[PDB]
Design a protein around this ligand. Structure first.
Ligand code: CDL
Ligand code: CDL
Ligand code: PLX
Ligand code: PLX
Ligand code: PEE
Ligand code: PEE
Ligand code: PEE
Lengths: 459, 178, 52, 56, 175, 64, 606
């Protein structure tokens, strides 16, 4: 596993020893090379994971997450170099250092064998994101949003630590393999109920679960393009990965304690999908759609069936790619008009046709158009929920109806109609932005031909 | 759509608008031409019956009952011209309307084609640039200190001037841009 | 993408298929049921003392 | 002229060697987990007349 | 073909009727079939025979991997991790093999339904019975284990089923 | 800008806890959750009771 | 290997070749539409062969060529079903599409994006073929959503027009409503039958329960625009006339009826679902024709006519005659598409005018279009020995001799009369009388593309019914013994509708004017269904999305409980703790109190 970690570490002295006009080129090239190297982890087994050493291991669940995390960094560098042009060399290198540190922390988090190390890295990921949001954000709210990002997570994650060090004091180990093999049932008691709550809510906050989701429309909106990209694509999936990992020790209590969270998630799908219909901010609309999509993965993990787990993995990967592309597309318009109001700039299909095509593809993939992996994950989760309960089909389908509504609306408001007259500074799209959307969307369509690569260990 | 609106519609304008609307809806009801001519003459006689009423209260009441009768008897599916706000080709060609400033972002290879057109465009741009200050001064001097009471704009008054705020009116894309 | 497409079958899907064909042949030829209800041999299971 | 290329492009070999070094650091780790090599009940086998270890 | 086994993928003797014409009109289907054979089939078989001659010049083989039988979870001690790991791997392999057996039976059923045409309800009772038996066995073994399944959970399910059967047998013997 | 600010950022400073506001919030945020919880609990208890006595016709239900 | 499978696969394969050439130097040249039309014609000619093979020996096949994946005991593979339905509908769809592209080469000659239009039509055709040839439910869903998205993109072709975007989004919404039922059926079949393909579903369901069939019926109602979800089809006329002629008239809108036909073995076992289907079809075929008999937009009249025909197809499905429904689909495609091309020709010749009130005497001004529309109206009304006679009259006679809901039969007969009623309306108001268009005459139909495209479908609408009906094997038991009065009932009601429609149309020539009645207002405003269902539920949903979901809950109370209460409590606690004047006299007394408390509470209890 060190063959991926060490080059990511070497990215730092490389960036700090590069020329003032050569940091972006070298960083992008070597991050793409690291992604190519990380592609080798997709060769998984059918019975047990890839145990590299006592500290790091890779399963079929963490391999696609690793690949996506390594792939996102070149895209973040490509999207960030536009608005950081007037920045000084030292601060450019500091921003690239923040991105590299975030990638390294995510790489170590997705492969840690022991739960305490996983928690340590999973919490260490907060610092670079907070620094990026609160230092390179554009508006005055970026400070407050930062606080919302910091204290929402910690208030959920601090009890988790108290749980973890407790478990090692009773079972003797926190290694995932030992925990899986030596699993024991959870008795129905208040102490076990609160231990279940402590081991779960830390991942519910990061999803975010409906009710504890207020930090996301702030953090995603006020963050820069790379911050929002890393927040939507990868940082939201940490909760899902941790919950899928830790639900082993929670049975059979998960049958009883999941009802409030299940109800919250199935109603939050409708609530957030309806909120998306009336949103004057485009970035806020994308952020709320992210919560609407993550509620489905919450339900899938809670119902605890193999089809649900496969659907959750596929939906996590697909949503990461789709949300990253949508945030990039919104940022392209923002860098022209310097406003996030959706109705300010209209009829952009006439002026930017290829960008309109990118918008159409992103919108179609967002609403789970078959045979995209978004649709595969959504349909697997729907079938698992229908097996869990038939009446669920009333809600999920309703959500689908709303999902296609606010998506195409978002496409109609910005791309169709007539252009606003007073705006006259809409320059043709650069090759960098078009390449960014192409690199966002081509793997998304490529993953259709090989879905088993992103279906998790339950395949 | 070119004329500046007024603060209110006088009685004469209201009656004329009602007459035109009633004639249009009658034509919608009377599909055949001769029948429409017959009933249009009947409607014109009905309107001329009170052509010289001097009691303004009585005239207003008569107009109110005429409006009520029209609203009751209007055609649910009146004929609309294709390019009218309700027609089948109202905003059909808006997707083909491109603003002219986009031509400023063309690559030099694209501007290599159509050289005479871009020379004339440069002449037009110079003409626009050379006359903006005079138009602003004319607007400042003609406008009352409180502000413009209406949206009507004054014409050019000297010899070498152009009417103020003329660029976007003159440089409209087209009615059939493609 | 080409590297991912031609990844060696480490999931043992074709191996599982081949074992399935062998077992189906054997059980159909001997007339045994194609699939057993118990995956573990009951002789190796020591159940509790009594039903009450 | 070799200096003109090396002195401003050596930062391009930090990540490459950082790759190969990592690979080496992986192999050494495999040397510390050989307590069951050719000892599992599923893969236990008689050694070839010339080989010394079933895997490195 | 010899690519697959005919005992595992059986089919009826393929009775077909000989052409018996009644009218003197030409058959367009025969003319089009001759055109397809002369224009499409012959170049394809020529290219394939060339490819086969090329393949025969380089003959190398690949082998089916054989796995030994290791003790199951029933013979492992409570906290003995090594035999537990080996038994769990063997159980996962057996689970995959059972899945593929169910897949083969389902393929038989699908081929039956398509082949028999309008008499599929009567001529495919054997396939339906085989699928019902295999599905019942698979449901008894692996159903309701859920995610995070293991050999221990399957053993517990089998023990519970065996207790239920023993109680039912004792109740029946009392009559 | 005024429209967007009023629709997004000016709402909470102009919010006061009132009986109407409290009742509407409690209803629209709490009632649906317990209604759906009751519906799903009733359906799942019925299904589990049917399973326990073994009358559901769960044949061919391999995938879940 | 027999050529059947190879030809069937190649017919679908060669349609995708012009799509791959969309980035080549043929897409930027004015020869692309002719290239696509030639490709479609060649595909139709290739597809003609498997149809001949089936007519010879009744040969059917399924080809499972590419194994997509395997989820435990479920295997998903790329499989195509080449039964009677596929091998019969593919040539008809290809022929209609070829004629439609030939017509569009003339209709959309002045459009700057004609190449994109033709490639969009080809993409829709590919999606429709995927829908028809699908063997499993996942591939069928792929084709379903493909044709839905293509319809969305083609309705809003003029994206600068608000009404086109509104109609496209409305169609998407109405189709998603039935997509809910489609997903319900897919989930039920996966859970209970452990399969998504048709073979295992048919094997494992001897008596299909209510829920999957209800989901399939909901999906079919959504796709075919039945009474519950009808209004999207009439409003889909905002798009170009070729889009209306190809997608929303003959080929795409029959997808729900086709889906119900594909699952007919399961529908034969459930009486309740058949009754529901019959009632829905009857109410749709009545209501749509009742709305049509007063419309002024010609495209709207044809849209309501095709919706009524779809309702008749659903009624036919409801009486357990799926093959009759498929035969009626195949027959309806021809004359409905050619009627739409005639309407488009009139619109183009009258300077993009669609209101029939401004169309006068075109009987002699447009002889070819006039004769084509006359033949089409005769075929649609069930004139004997035309194309529509071999399907519609048999449908009526089958409903007349079945254990049927009496109201459904009565509404079907009334709809049969109203069909002739609105055909008379169209003919009388578009071709008879005196001209009512602007005097600058632009009427010109002497274009070889238009003439040939209309003439091919005219020959179809004349002879295809007899050609097909005599070449398919019998799929049902005929109704050979009928009373004379009930054998001619379809003809009697069609004739009677003809006479009353002609009489009430000639009534308009009198010099009498009177205000409309409430029945006419109900009929003309589409039963007030769009005026109510597009305003009340939409307003309530969009108001609740902001008043409660966004403002009351997200922006106020969720903030009030967790973060704002925490901030307020911490601020108050900090203010209380840090508000000390710094006088030793106070906190030394506090030290004294603390010392006493520690000596008493803790030290005295050891
Ligand atoms: C099934 C068709 C068979 C095709 C044969 C193979 C073709 C391979 C294409 C692969 C995808 C292309 C890459 C995507 C980005 C496009 C690049 C671009 O910028 O275009 C500029 C380029 C240059 O033209 P231009 O004049 O400069 O235009 C500039 C303006 O922007 C003007 O722009 P515009 O107005 O021309 O719009 C661009 C165009 C293209 O933009 C797109 O949106 C295309 C992307 C598809 C939709 C993506 C999101 C939806 C989720 C579905 C995901 C499917 C993944 C399948 C696997 C993909 C493998 C990579 O948009 C459309 O045509 C409408 C798209 C809606 C399609 C709805 C149908 C969905 C279901 C259909 C079946 C899918 C599975 C097939 C197998 C089923 C069982 C047999 O335009 C093109 O050359 C056309 C692009 C190719 C057309 C693709 C349409 C169908 C492809 C569906 C998936 C492919 C399956 C292949 C397997 C074989 C079957
Ligand atoms: C074979 C044995 C069977 C023999 C049967 C006996 C012989 C035939 C029986 C006669 C049946 C009717 C025939 C006359 C057609 C009517 C034409 C007409 O002028 O009507 C005048 C008038 C409309 O004329 P208008 O407004 O002055 O015209 C304006 C301009 O002309 C505007 O000019 P325009 O250019 O726009 O044109 C407007 C349009 C006309 O505009 C309209 O839309 C009005 C016409 C309505 C047609 C409705 C016919 C069928 C309706 C079925 C409804 C089912 C139940 C629905 C009730 C829901 C209750 C809420 O004109 C046309 O395009 C042609 C009209 C269609 C003629 C062809 C119709 C033939 C099919 C019907 C007869 C059935 C024969 C086959 C049966 C075989 C069965 C064995 O409508 C009526 O007053 C009568 C309508 C008939 C049904 C309405 C029933 C009363 C409604 C309220 C009842 C109380 C409800 C209390 C509450 C209950 C709550 C539970
Ligand atoms: C906005 C979203 C934020 C996140 C929301 C998270 C939701 C947390 C809720 C936890 C779900 C279950 C917790 C406890 C399980 C049952 C709770 C209770 O209602 O059940 C009864 C419990 O009985 C009584 O109700 C005792 C609880 C009453 C006191 C608790 C206060 C509940 C008020 C709601 C507080 C709001 C929660 C969120 C705080 C911010 C069952 O009766 P009994 O058979 O005897 O007990 C069985 C449990 N045993 C086995 C451990 C003994
Ligand atoms: C611009 C103009 C557009 C129109 C013109 C286009 C011209 C045509 C080109 C389009 C081709 C159409 C595709 C038709 C399908 C054929 C390809 C298919 O056969 O290959 C698949 C193979 O595809 C691969 O499986 C998928 C590639 C993996 C995608 C990964 C993306 C690259 C990494 C980037 C990182 C991004 C993050 C990802 C997070 C997980 C089949 O999978 P498989 O059944 O096995 O193969 C069987 C044989 N094997 C096993 C011996 C190999
Ligand atoms: C381009 C033209 C090339 C001309 C020369 C080639 C001539 C024939 C060469 C044959 C190549 C070898 C071959 O095809 O063997 C089959 C080989 C291996 O068999 P599998 O079924 O894939 O094994 C299971 C694992 N997937 O499969 C292939 O590689 C070919 C697959 C092509 C399928 C056709 C296209 C279908 C996919 C389109 C997109 C569909 C997305 C998902 C749809 C979901 C369906 C439910
Ligand atoms: C018993 C004790 C329990 C202790 C629990 C610790 C709670 C952790 C959060 C502490 C945050 C307190 C912040 C505070 O009160 O300051 C008020 C502060 C005043 O503004 P200043 O920052 O001082 O500067 C601007 C004025 N010149 O008000 C604000 O502006 C608040 C804006 C940011 C709020 C961020 C808090 C987000 C909370 C999310 C929920 C997590 C709560 C933690 C406990 C969870 C329950 C177990
Ligand atoms: C952004 C908001 C997120 C909120 C996160 C906070 C919720 C976490 C839930 C409470 C965490 C406390 C659990 C600590 C770890 C449990 C480990 C454990 O099992 O210990 C139990 C003990 O469990 C406890 O003591 C925990 C009691 C709770 C103390 C702190 C109260 C905090 C509030 C609890 C209720 C709120 C929970 C939901 C919060 C909703 C937020 C919206 C048993 O220990 P023994 O003494 O050995 O008993 C067996 C031998 N007789």
């Amino acid at each position: 596993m060190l063959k991926i970690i060490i080059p990511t570490t070497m990215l730092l002295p490389m960036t700090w020893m590069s020329k003032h006009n050569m940091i972006w080129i070298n960083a992008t090239v070597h991050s793409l090379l690291i992604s190519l190297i990380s592609l080798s982890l997709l060769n998984q087994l059918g019975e047990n994971s890839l145990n590299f050493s006592l500290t790091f291991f890779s399963d079929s669940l963490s391999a696609p997450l690793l690949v996506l995390t390594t792939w996102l960094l070149p895209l973040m560098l490509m999207a960030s170099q536009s608005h950081l042009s007037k920045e000084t060399t030292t601060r450019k290198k500091l921003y690239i250092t923040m991105l590299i540190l975030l990638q390294l922390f995510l790489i170590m988090t997705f492969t840690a064998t022991e739960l305490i190390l996983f928690y340590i890295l999973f919490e260490a990921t907060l610092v670079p994101t907070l620094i990026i949001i609160t230092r390179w954000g554009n508006q005055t709210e970026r400070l407050n949003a930062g606080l919302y990002f910091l204290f929402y997570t910690l208030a959920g994650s601090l009890p988790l630590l108290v749980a973890l060090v407790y478990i090692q004091n009773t079972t003797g180990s926190l290694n995932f393999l030992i925990i899986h093999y030596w699993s024991h049932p959870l008795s129905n008691s208040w102490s076990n109920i609160f231990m279940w709550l402590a081991c779960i809510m830390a991942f519910m906050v990061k999803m975010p679960l409906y009710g504890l989701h207020l930090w996301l429309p702030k953090a995603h909106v006020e963050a820069p393009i790379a911050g929002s990209m890393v927040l939507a694509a990868v940082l939201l999936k940490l909760g899902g990965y941790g919950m899928m990992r830790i639900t082993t020790i929670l049975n059979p209590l998960t049958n009883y304690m999941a009802y409030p969270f299940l109800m919250l998630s199935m109603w939050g799908m409708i609530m957030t999908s309806s909120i998306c219909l009336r949103q004057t901010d485009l970035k806020s609309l994308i952020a709320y759609s992210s919560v609407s999509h993550m509620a489905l993965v919450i339900v899938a993990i809670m119902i605890q069936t193999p089809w649900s787990f496969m659907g959750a993995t596929a939906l996590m990967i697909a949503h990461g790619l789709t949300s990253s592309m949508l945030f990039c597309l919104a940022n392209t318009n923002y860098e022209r008009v310097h406003s996030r109001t959706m109705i300010l700039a209209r009829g952009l299909q006439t002026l930017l046709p290829l960008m309109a095509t990118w918008w159409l593809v992103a919108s179609l993939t967002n609403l789970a158009l078959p045979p995209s992996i978004n649709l595969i994950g959504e349909l697997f989760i729907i079938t698992a929920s229908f097996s869990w309960s038939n009446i669920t089909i009333i809600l999920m389908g309703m959500n689908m109806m709303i999902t296609a509504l606010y998506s195409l609306y978002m496409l109609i408001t910005t791309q169709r109609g007539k252009y606003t007259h007073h705006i006259n500074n809409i320059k043709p799209s650069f090759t960098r932005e078009n390449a960014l959307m192409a690199l966002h969307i081509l793997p998304l369509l490529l993953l259709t031909l090989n879905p088993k690569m992103i279906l998790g260990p339950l395949y | 759509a070119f004329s500046a609106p007024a603060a209110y519609l006088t009685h004469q304008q209201k009656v004329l608008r009602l007459y035109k609307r009633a004639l249009r809806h009658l034509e919608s009801w009377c599909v055949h031409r001769d029948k429409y001519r017959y009933f249009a003459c009947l409607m014109r006689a009905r309107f001329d019956e009170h052509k010289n009423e001097k009691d303004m209260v009585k005239a207003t009441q008569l107009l109110r009952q005429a409006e009520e009768e029209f609203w009751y008897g209007q055609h649910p599916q009146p004929y609309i011209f294709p390019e009218s706000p309700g027609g089948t080709s109202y905003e059909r060609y808006e997707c083909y309307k491109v603003p002219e400033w986009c031509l400023d972002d063309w690559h030099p290879s694209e501007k290599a084609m159509y050289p005479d057109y871009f020379a004339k465009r440069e002449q037009w741009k110079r003409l626009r640039r050379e006359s903006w200050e005079r138009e602003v001064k004319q607007l400042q001097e003609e406008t009352p200190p409180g502000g413009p009471r209406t949206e009507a704009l004054p014409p050019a008054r000297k010899e070498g001037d152009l009417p103020p705020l003329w660029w976007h009116i003159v440089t409209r894309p087209r009615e059939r841009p493609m | 993408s080409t590297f991912v497409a031609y990844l060696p079958d480490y999931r043992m899907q074709e191996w599982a298929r081949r074992e399935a064909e062998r077992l189906v042949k054997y059980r159909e030829a001997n007339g045994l049921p194609l699939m057993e209800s118990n995956c573990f041999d009951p002789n190796k299971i020591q159940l509790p003392e009594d039903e009450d | 002229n070799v200096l003109q290329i090396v002195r401003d492009h050596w930062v391009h070999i930090l990540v490459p060697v950082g790759f190969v070094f990592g690979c080496y650091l992986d192999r050494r780790s495999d040397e510390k987990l050989t307590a069951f090599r050719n000892k599992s009940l599923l893969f236990k086998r008689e050694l070839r007349p010339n080989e010394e270890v079933t895997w490195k | 073909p010899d690519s697959w086994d005919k005992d595992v993928y059986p089919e009826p003797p393929r009775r077909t009727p000989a052409p018996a014409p009644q009218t003197s009109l030409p058959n367009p289907v025969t003319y089009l079939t001759k055109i397809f054979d002369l224009l499409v089939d012959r170049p394809v078989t020529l290219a394939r025979e060339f490819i086969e001659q090329q393949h025969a010049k380089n003959r190398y083989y690949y082998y089916h991997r054989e796995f030994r039988r290791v003790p199951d979870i029933t013979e492992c001690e409570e906290k003995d991790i090594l035999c537990m790991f080996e038994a769990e791997m063997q159980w996962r392999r057996d689970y995959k093999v059972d899945q593929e057996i169910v897949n083969i039976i389902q393929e038989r059923l699908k081929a039956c339904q398509q082949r028999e045409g309008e008499s599929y309800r009567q001529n495919c009772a054997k396939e339906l019975e085989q699928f019902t038996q295999v599905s019942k066995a698979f449901q008894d073994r692996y159903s309701d284990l859920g995610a995070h399944y293991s050999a221990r959970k399957c053993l517990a399910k089998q023990k519970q089923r065996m207790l239920a059967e023993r109680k039912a047998a004792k109740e029946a013997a009392a009559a | 800008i005024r429209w967007t600010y009023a629709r997004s950022a000016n709402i909470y400073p102009n919010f006061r806890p009132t009986p109407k506001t409290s009742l509407l919030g409690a209803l629209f945020g709490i009632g649906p959750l317990f209604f759906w919880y009751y519906v799903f609990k009733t359906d799942r208890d019925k299904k589990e009771k049917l399973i326990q006595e073994g009358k559901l016709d769960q044949t061919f239900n391999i995938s879940y | 290997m027999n050529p059947f499978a190879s030809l069937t696969l190649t017919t679908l394969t060669i349609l995708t070749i012009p799509i791959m050439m969309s980035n080549s130097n043929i897409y930027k040249t004015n020869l692309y539409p002719n290239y696509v039309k030639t490709t479609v014609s060649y595909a139709f000619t290739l597809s003609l062969v498997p149809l001949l093979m089936f007519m010879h020996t009744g040969q059917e096949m399924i080809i499972s060529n590419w194994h997509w994946m395997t989820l435990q005991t479920v295997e998903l593979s790329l499989s195509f079903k080449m039964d009677y339905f596929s091998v019969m509908f593919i040539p008809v769809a290809l022929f209609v599409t070829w004629s439609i592209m030939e017509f569009s080469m003339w209709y959309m000659h002045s459009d700057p994006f004609i190449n994109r239009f033709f490639k969009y039509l080809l993409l829709f055709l590919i999606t429709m073929m995927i829908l028809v040839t699908a063997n499993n439910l996942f591939q069928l869903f792929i084709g379903w959503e493909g044709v839905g998205i293509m319809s969305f993109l083609l309705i809003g072709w003029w994206h600068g027009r608000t009404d086109a975007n509104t109609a496209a989004l409305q169609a998407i919404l109405y189709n998603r409503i039935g997509d809910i039922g489609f997903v319900l059926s897919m989930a039920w079949f996966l859970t209970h039958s452990n399969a998504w393909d048709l073979q295992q579903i048919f094997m494992l369901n001897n008596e299909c329960p209510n829920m999957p069939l209800i989901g399939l019926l909901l999906a079919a109602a959504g796709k075919s625009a039945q009474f519950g979800l009808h209004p999207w089809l009439p409003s889909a006329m905002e798009g170009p006339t070729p889009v209306s002629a190809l997608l929303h008239s003959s080929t795409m809108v029959v997808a729900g009826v086709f889906l119900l036909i594909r699952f007919y073995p399961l529908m034969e076992t459930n009486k309740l679902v058949q009754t529901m289907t019959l009632c829905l079809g009857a109410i749709t075929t009545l209501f749509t024709a009742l709305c049509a008999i007063t419309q002024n937009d010609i495209k709207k009249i044809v849209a309501f006519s095709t919706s009524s025909q779809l309702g008749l197809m659903m009624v036919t499905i409801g009486i357990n005659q799926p093959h009759l429904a498929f035969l009626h689909i195949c027959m309806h495609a021809f004359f409905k598409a050619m009627l739409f091309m005639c309407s488009g020709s009139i619109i183009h010749s009258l300077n993009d005018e669609q209101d029939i009130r401004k169309m006068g005497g075109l009987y002699k001004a447009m002889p070819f279009t006039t004769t084509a529309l006359i033949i089409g109206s005769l075929a649609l009304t069930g004139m004997p020995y035309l194309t529509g006679f071999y399907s519609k009259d048999l449908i009526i006679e089958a409903v007349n001799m079945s254990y049927t809901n009496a109201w459904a039969l009565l509404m079907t007969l009334i709809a049969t009369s109203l069909t002739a009623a609105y055909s008379t309306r169209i003919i009388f108001f578009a071709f008879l009388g005196k001209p009512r268009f602007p005097p600058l005459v632009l009427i010109n139909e002497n274009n070889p593309l238009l003439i040939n495209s209309i003439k091919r479908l005219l020959i179809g609408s004349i002879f295809a019914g007899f050609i097909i009906s005599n070449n398919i094997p019998p799929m049902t038991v005929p109704n050979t013994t009928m009373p004379l009065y009930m054998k001619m009932t379809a003809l009697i009601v069609t004739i009677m509708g003809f006479m009353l429609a002609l009489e009430l149309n000639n009534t308009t020539y009198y010099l009498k004017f009177k205000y409309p009645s409430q029945t006419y207002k109900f009929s003309n405003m589409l039963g007030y269904y769009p005026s109510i269902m597009h305003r009340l539920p939409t307003y309530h949903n969009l108001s609740m999305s902001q008043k409660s979901a966004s403002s009351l809950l997200d922006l106020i109370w969720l903030e009030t409980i967790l973060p704002k209460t925490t901030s307020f409590i911490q601020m108050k606690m900090s203010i209380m703790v840090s508000n000390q004047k710094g006088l030793i006299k106070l906190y030394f007394l506090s030290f004294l109190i603390t010392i006493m408390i520690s000596m008493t509470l803790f030290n005295y209890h050891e």
